[model samples]
Target: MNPFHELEPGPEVPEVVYALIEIPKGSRNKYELDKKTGLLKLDRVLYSPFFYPVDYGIIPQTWYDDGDPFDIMVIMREPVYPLTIIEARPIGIMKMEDSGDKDWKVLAVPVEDPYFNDWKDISDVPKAFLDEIAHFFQRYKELQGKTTKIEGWGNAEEAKREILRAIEMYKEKFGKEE
Candidate 1:
C-alpha cells in the first residue's frame, strides 16, 4: 500500500499531524509519489541554489484541488531524510497559485524540535525566515519554465482550517472506495 494513503492523520485535527516526507531539505531533485505503485518517483532535477528550503512532504489521505494530497513544508533545524514520518504542528501557510491551480504550502515545525516547539503561530517565526521560504517557492520553478504566484501568508488558524477542509474533501471524494 502507498504509505501516503495508508498513514493516519493522527488522533487530532489541527493540533498534531502526520506528514509523509517526499523531498528532503537541500535536494536538487524533486520527488513525487506514484499513486499506482505506492512508491516515490523522481519528478525532476532543480537548478542550483533553488533546492527546497525546508523538508517537503504531503499530508496523508488529504486531497487538494490539484488532484493530490495536501502539501506541507516542515521546518526543522537539522535536515531530515525522505520518506520519514514525522509529527508536526501547523504554524502557517504559503498561499500559492501554481500554473493556474491553487497550491498552498502548509508551514509546520516538527514536534521533536526544541527550538521551534514554542512557535504557536506564524508570527512567532522571524520575518526573514518566512521571507526566505516565500522567495524560494516563488522562483524555484522559474528555471524549469513554470510559474508560481504567491498570495502571501496566513497564520496558524488559517492553516488549521485549510487542513480540515482538505480532509473533508478527501473523504467526500474517496469515501466510497474502501
Candidate 2:
C-alpha cells in the first residue's frame, strides 16, 4: 500500500511519526511510490554526484502546495532502505521554493536515535551539519536544469505549523481517503 496514504501521523501532528523512507543516505536515486500499485519504484537517477545525505520521505495524510504529500528529511546516524517506515520527531523546516513553487522540506530526527533524541529543535544541530543539509537541497536538481531556492530554516514550532497546514490541505483536497 502507499505508506503515505495508509500510515498514521502518530499521536500528534508534530509528534513521533512513521515516515516511509523513499531515498536513503548516499543514494543518487529519486524513489517514489507507484500511484496505481502503491509500490515503491525508482523515479530517476541523479544526474551526477548529488545524493541524499539524510533519509528522505513523505509525511502521510498530508499534502503540500505541490499536490503531493509534504516532504520529510529524517536525521539519523545510519541509513535506512527505501520503503522502510521509522518513527521520527519533527524538529524544523528547510523552507524552500523549487521551480518557482514552494516546496518546503520538513526536518525531523528519529525518535529512538540516542544521538538525536535529545535535540528539541534544529538549532540544537551543529551549524556545519545544518549548512551541509541545506547545501544538498540547493544543488539537488541543479544538473536536471531545475532551480531550488532555500528561503530559510525555522524551529520546531514553525515546522509543526507547516505539517498541520499540509494535513489540512490534504483533507481539503482529497478528503479522508486516498
Candidate 3:
C-alpha cells in the first residue's frame, strides 16, 4: 500500500505521530517514496562524506506547502529499515527552506525508544547533535548545486501547529478519504 495515504499520522498526532522512514540513519544514499507507484525510489547519493544524522522520513496523511509530504527526522538509538513506520513524539521543528520552499523537519524520537523517548523539547536534545543534523542539510547538496536555508529551530508547540497545518493542506489538495 501507499504508505503516504495508508500509514496515517496516528492517534497521538502532533504530539506523537507516525514516521514512515525513507532513508535510515548513517545512510549516504537518499531514498524517497515514488508517489505515482507507491514504491521506494533511490533518489540520489550524497557527494559529501557525511551521512544522515537521523532517520529521515515523511509524516503520512499530511502534505506540506511545498507539494510534498511533511518531512520528519526520527532520532533513535539505532537505525531502522526503509519504509518502516515508527510512532514518534515530536520535540522540535527544524525551520528550513529548500530551493525557496518551506521544507521543515519535525524532529522527533521513536515513542518506543528508551533513550530518546524521554526528550520533551528541542532543548533536551544535545546542541552538538542538533548542529550536526542542521549541518547535514546545509551542505549535503552543495556539490549537487541545490541551495538550502536553515531558519533555525522551533519549540514543540510550533511543531504541533505545523503538523496541523500540513494536515489541512493535505485535505485541501487530496480531500478527505475513507
Candidate 4:
C-alpha cells in the first residue's frame, strides 16, 4: 500500500502550478540547492513574472542564468488539512536557452507525486490543470461527481495510471533506481 493512502479526504487529487525566474542577459551563474536546509540559491530570476498557477501562490524558480544548467527543485507548502496526495506532475519541464514566452505542454494529469503537503489542500491546485481533468473525466463519462467535486489525484483507474507514468518518466530522466 502507498503511504499516501493513509491521508485524509482522499489520496488522489488534481492541481495546477507553474515556475518562474529572472535571469539577466550576460550573467553566467546558476541556482544551487542546500538539500539539508531546503534553500534554493539562484543567480537571478529568468523572468520578472512567475510561471502559471499564480492563483495557488508563488511557485518561484529558485535559480536562473544565461549560461550553465542549474539543478532545479520544486517547493510546495503543506496543506492545513490532513489529506492524502494521490497524484502530482509538472505540466512540462521547459529548458529555454534564451528568454522568450514559452507555453506549457502538459505531460500528463493525475500524476501520483507520492507527495502530500500536510499544510496544503485542494484549493492550492491551479485552475488550468483542474480543467484538464474535468474535461477528461466528462468526456469519458466515467466521472459521476461534479467537476468541482474533484480532490486528491482523482476517482478513476486512469488517475492511477497518470501518476505511475509520471513517476516512471521522472525515474528515467533522473536515472533513479526504485
Candidate 5:
C-alpha cells in the first residue's frame, strides 16, 4: 500500500525540494490529492474571487499539523499539469494560522529555472508577489468565516527548518517504511 506516503519528498530536500502541484497557478478550483484515492479530488469551488497568485500544493511524506501534507506555494510563470512532482528551491515561508491553528505556506521557485537565478532568498522575492499572496489568502479565508492570520515572515533558513519539522513529524506519525 504505497499510496502517497511512498512518494519521495524530493531528490534533495530543504535545499531543492519537491512539490506536488494540486492547484495550478491560474484558476482557483480548490482541488487536492485525496490521500486514500491517490488522485485529484475537487474539494471545493472557489469561495473568493481572486485567482491564486502561485502554484499551490504540498510536499509528500511531510505532514502539516493537521494530518495533511505540508502546504507549499511555488512561484512559476507557467502552469503545469496538476499532481505532477516538480523540484523547487525553498525561498521562505508565509507563517500563517487558520482558525487558531498553524496553516503555514511554504514558498519556492522551480529549481534551475532561469527566471529565479537572482531570487535566492525571500528578501530577493518581490514584495509585490508576497503582498498578492497575503491579500488573496485573507480575503479567501474571511469569505468563509475562518479566522486567518499572516503572523510572520520566515526567510530561507526557517523554511528549511519547517520542512524538516514536517518530515520528522510525518515519520513519528507513520514510522519509516520498512
Candidate 6:
C-alpha cells in the first residue's frame, strides 16, 4: 500500500521545503496553478538560482492575484507531510546576467533533509504517513548521491523520475507489494 494512502488525514500537515535560486532584485510576475495539474510555472528565468524556498506553511495560491511581496512565499499544506532543505550552495560557475555582464553566475546546490525519523512526533501524523515521508526523503538522499550534482532543474522528466523513484523506494522499505 502507498504509505501516504494509509495515513489518516493529519490534524495539521507538516511543511515541505522548496528551494530555488533568487529572482532578480525586483520583478513582479504572474504565478498560476491549474487547480488540476500540480505543476507550477512562471516566465522563463534567466539566472540559474531562480528557485525560492517555498515552505509548506502556506500554499502558493494564498498569495496569488495580489502578487507576492517576499518575491517568494513560504508554502505549507493543511495536513503536512513535508521535507526540509538541509543545504543549498551555488554551482560556482559564472554566467552572463541579463545586462550582458559576465560577473553574474548561476546557483545550484544539493538540498537535503538531515532528519527523517522525527516526522511522527507531530500531533496527528499517522504512522503510515510518517513512513512515506521518511522513505521519500531517504530516497532523495540516495539519488542526491555523494557527488555534488545539479540534475533536476528545468528537466521535468528527471524531476518526475526522482519523485516516482522515491515513492517506489517507500514501498520497498515498507515491504509492500508492487
Which has the greatest TM-score?
Answer: 3
Per-candidate alpha-carbon RMSD to the true structure: 1.5, 1.7, 1.2, 15.3, 1.5, 20.0
Pairs with backbone N, CA or C atoms under 3 Å apart (clashes), candidate 5: none
lDDT of every model, 2 decimals: 0.86, 0.84, 0.89, 0.29, 0.84, 0.26
lDDT of 6 by residue, 1-178 (tens): 3212333211221122123212221222223322244333453332332222222111221111122211122122211222222222222221222222222211222223333233222222344633443332233223324222222222223322332333444455546675
TM-score of 6: 0.23
Worst 10 residues of 4 by lDDT: 54-63
Please list the residue runs of candidate 4 whose C-alpha ends up more than 4 Å from where it truly belongs after superposition.
Answer: 1-38, 46-163
Q: Kindly list the per-residue Cα lDDT of model 2 for residues 12-82, writing each as its tens digit.
A: 66766667788898888889877677788899988778879899988877889987888898986789988
Q: What is the C-alpha local distance difference test score of candidate 1?
A: 0.86
What is the C-alpha lDDT profile of model 3 across 1-178, one tens digit per residue? 7879887687777788999999999999999999987699999888988799899999998999789999999986779999899999989999889999999999998888788756989999889998988888899999988999999999999999999999888888887854
lDDT of 4 by residue, 49-98 (tens): 22322111112221123222121113333321111122333332222222
- Which residue runs does candidate 6 get wrong by more than 4 Å? 1-52, 56-154
Q: Is 1 or 6 the stronger prediction by TM-score?
A: 1
Q: Each model's TM-score, in the order given?
A: 0.94, 0.94, 0.96, 0.24, 0.94, 0.23
Compare candidates 3 and 6 on lDDT and give the better one: 3
RMSD of 4: 15.3
RMSD in Å for model 3 = 1.2
Positional deviation of 91 in candidate 1, in angstroms?
Answer: 0.5
Task: Sort the candidates on lDDT, descending order.
Answer: 3, 1, 5, 2, 4, 6
Segments of candidate 1 deviating more than 4 angstroms: none
Off by over 4 Å in 5: 1-3
Per-residue CA lDDT of candidate 1, range 24-49, in tens? 98888899888887688998887656
- Cα lDDT tens digits, model 5, 1-178, are 4335768778888898789888989867888888787888998878877687899988988987866789999988888778878798899999888888798989999886798887878999878878889888777857778888888679998999999999888888887753
Better of 4 and 6 by lDDT: 4
